[PDB]
């Protein structure tokens, strides 16, 4: 989830 | 400005949405929103071409609700490009690598950089998704097939950012994150009530949709009393009690969504501008639900990856033990809702811990978010000073102190309240779950509050 | 001594709710209808999109 | 850069949707  | 300048040539190579010549009326902003979600819904029903076997356990099942994702389709990544690229933009801006600015050419450069990283995240996640073992074995799939799936997910991710930007530029009613998350949740609830899908287990043909099942059971069994009991108390398939629970949670969350502290304010710079500044009880609309769900869902993915590879380690087992795949021990078990009423009785500690974590995390996330999103009392007080607004019964110096009494309490208690409603929805077995239903109600209210804002201006 | 921070939070939360403006009957049905309309638009458009594509996915895929 | 309107996005989205359908339709014919 949202992992850059 | 050094990081945005070097990537500036690479920012302009992606398509952009034309800024509207004039403001679109709310009637046509809904229509473009409906068209935008229709495209997203169609794309999430079309499977990827190169998939060889969608039989393995799904690795990212827990973010599917909050990522608006559908496994094995063009919307496999969902809104992950939007969430991740926006996060990188905030982290870079927060750490002063880049500046969001206010110049129209600077904002376009900021948008182009966010789009550029969305493609980078889309490509990076597409490779990771392929290598997770879904769609079949990548070595048996072949380089061409794996490359083709990445191409499909790349163009689909470009479409999502194009659709997301379309809503933001003034054609739609908000962001792609809010619309696509709520659209899948609303679709899921309606599917559980009206799906014509039928399953046979020996007793006969039973509709998967609760409302369709009620009509089928009454007609087939000729108004049998047991048919009503089966329609309401069905465990194998969605039943009417779960739908009634869903409606009850919708009503309760709507009631608390309308809670607000109304500050009576006047303007001192331009006299005659009077109004009400509302401080909602749900001060952070659905961020505590998103932040909690993202934390648990990301933790579940990490736990399963470590359990499969580094099995037997004490730290890995403490993180979570898995036995479909659901937690049975470790940290991840206490972050999961109780399975049933009997599960609460046999393990009262887990039920208490889950409730405490659900209330504590949502309350903590809500009060932490206001110190990051800029809705803290100090930032709101500065906006009052910039606009010259003061509170009626309070002095011009006593604006931050009064805001210190309401906003921190509204965030902490509002997150605790929105954490309790998710537990109540989960404990009642509501179709949609606790996270999904509360997300759907809060996102729709953001669209309703846009409608009244436009109506008030007119 | 975590009792005092918890006691103050409860008192502040109880005080906050009393001073909040609750939705009236007229206000409740305005948001309930808006949520129902919003749920119906997203829920039923997706319902028919999913229903349409089940034969389509079977034929094409 | 290129600045398209809302209608081209709908057309491009449908073109990509149709292209993926063509991939499956071609895949059915090239394998059977």
> Are B201 and B183 a contacting pair, CB within 8 Å?
no
Torsion B69-B182-B373-B32 (CA) sign:
positive
Q: Which residues pair with B264 in a beta bridge?
A: B276
Task: Give CA–CA dist B217/B432, Å, rounded.
Answer: 24
- At residue B205, what are phi and psi to the nearest 5 degrees? -85, 125
Structure tokens at B454: 């436009």
Burial of residue C14 (number of CB atoms within 10 Å: 0-12, 13-18, 19+): exposed
Dist CA C2 CA C12 (whole Å): 15
DSSP B89-147: HHHHHHTTSS---SSHHHHHHHHHHHHHHHHHHHHHHHHHHHHTTTTS-HHHH-HHHHH
Question: Considering only residues 11 to 30 of chain D, which have any Cβ-Cβ distance to chain B shorter than 8 Å?
Answer: 12-14, 16-17, 20-21, 23-24, 27
**All structural domains of chain B with their residue ranges:** 2-193+240-457
* Angle, CA of B114, B120 and B125, to the nearest 5°: 120
SS3 state of residue D4: strand
**Domain chopping of chain C, boundaries:** 1-61
Method: cryo-EM
DSSP classification of residue B231: H
Residue B134 backbone phi and psi in degrees, to 5: -70, 160
Q: How many Cα atoms are found within 13 Å in the side-chain-facing hemisphere of B177?
A: 16
Q: What length does chain B have?
A: 458
Task: Name the packing angle between helices B176-194 and B240-257 (round to 10°).
Answer: 150
For residue B105, give Cα distances in angstroms to B8, B12, B21, B91, D19: 11, 12, 17, 21, 35
β-pairing, B274-280 vs B321-322, is unpaired
Alpha helices in B321-432 (DSSP H): 330-334, 341-346, 348-373, 377-387, 400-427
Calpha distance B408→B368 (Å, rounded): 10
B162 CB neighbours in chain D (<8 A) are 9, 12-13
The beta strand positions in B113-259, using DSSP E, are 198-200, 205-207
Q: How far separated are the first and last CA of chain A, in Å rounded? A: 9
Q: Could you tell me which chain A residue has the CA closest to the CA of B80?
A: A2
Cα(B161)–Cα(C40) distance, integer angstroms: 25
Touching D (3+ Cβ pairs <8 A), the chains are B, C
- Ordered by start, the domain boundaries in chain D are 1-32
Q: Which residues of B touch C23 (CB under 8 A)?
A: 254-255, 258-259
Residue B278, number of CB atoms within 10 A of its CB: 13
Q: Are D6 and B166 in contact (CB under 8 A)?
A: yes
- Data resolution in angstroms: 2.6
């Amino acid at each position: 989830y949202a992992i850059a | 400005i050094k990081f945005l300048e070097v990537i500036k040539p690479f920012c302009v190579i992606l398509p952009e949405i034309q800024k509207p010549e004039r403001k679109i009326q709310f009637k046509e902003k809904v229509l473009w929103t409906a068209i935008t979600l229709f495209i997203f819904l169609v794309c999430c029903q079309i499977p990827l071409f190169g998939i060889m076997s969608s039989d393995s356990a799904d690795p990212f099942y827990w973010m599917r609700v909050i990522l608006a994702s559908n496994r094995g389709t063009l919307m496999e990544l969902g809104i992950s490009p939007i969430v991740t690229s926006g996060l990188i933009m905030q982290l870079l801006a927060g750490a002063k690598i880049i500046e969001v600015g206010d110049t129209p050419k600077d904002r376009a450069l900021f948008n182009g950089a966010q789009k550029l990283f969305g493609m980078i995240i889309t490509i990076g996640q597409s490779i990771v998704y392929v290598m997770t073992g879904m769609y079949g074995d990548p070595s048996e799939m072949g380089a061409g097939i794996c490359l083709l799936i990445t191409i499909q997910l790349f163009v689909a991710g470009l479409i999502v950012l194009l659709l997301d930007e379309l809503l933001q530029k003034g054609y739609g009613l908000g962001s792609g994150i809010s619309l696509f998350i709520a659209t899948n949740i609303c679709e899921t609830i309606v599917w559980k009530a009206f799906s014509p899908t039928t399953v046979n287990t020996g007793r006969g043909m039973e509709f998967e949709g609760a409302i369709i099942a009620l009509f089928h059971l009454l007609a087939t069994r000729t108004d049998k009393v047991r048919a009503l009991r089966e329609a309401f108390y069905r465990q194998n398939l969605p039943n009417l009690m779960n739908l009634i629970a869903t409606i009850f949670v919708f009503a309760v969350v709507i009631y608390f969504q309308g809670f607000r502290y109304e500050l009576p304010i006047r303007s001192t710079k331009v006299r005659g501008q009077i109004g009400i500044y509302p401080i909602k009880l749900f001060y952070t609309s659905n961020i505590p639900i998103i932040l909690q769900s993202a934390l648990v869902s990301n933790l579940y993915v990490i736990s399963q990856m470590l359990s499969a590879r580094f099995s037997g380690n004490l730290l890995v087992s403490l993180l979570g033990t898995w036995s479909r795949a659901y937690p049975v021990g470790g940290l991840c078990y206490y972050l999961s809702p109780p399975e049933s009423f009997g599960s609460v009785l046999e393990d009262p500690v887990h039920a208490v811990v889950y409730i405490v974590f659900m209330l504590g995390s949502c309350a903590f996330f809500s009060k932490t978010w206001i110190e990051v999103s800029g809705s803290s009392p100090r930032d709101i007080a500065k906006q009052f000073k910039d606009q010259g607004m003061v509170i009626n019964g309070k002095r011009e110096t006593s604006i931050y102190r009064e805001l210190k009494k309401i906003i921190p309490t509204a965030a902490a208690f509002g997150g605790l309240c929105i954490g309790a409603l998710s537990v109540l929805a989960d404990f009642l077995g509501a179709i949609g779950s606790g996270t999904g239903i509360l997300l759907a109600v809060t996102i729709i209210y953001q669209y309703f509050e846009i409608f009244v804002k436009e109506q008030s201006e007119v | 001594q975590f009792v005092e921070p918890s006691r103050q939070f409860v008192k502040d939360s109880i005080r906050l709710v009393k001073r909040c403006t609750k939705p009236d009957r007229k206000e409740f049905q305005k948001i309930a209808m808006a949520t129902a309309i919003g749920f119906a638009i997203m829920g039923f458009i997706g319902f028919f999109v999913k229903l349409i594509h089940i034969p389509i996915n079977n034929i094409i895929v | 850069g290129l600045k398209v309107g809302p209608v081209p996005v709908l057309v491009m989205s449908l073109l990509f949707i149709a292209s993926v359908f063509m991939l499956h339709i071609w895949g059915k014919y090239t394998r059977s």
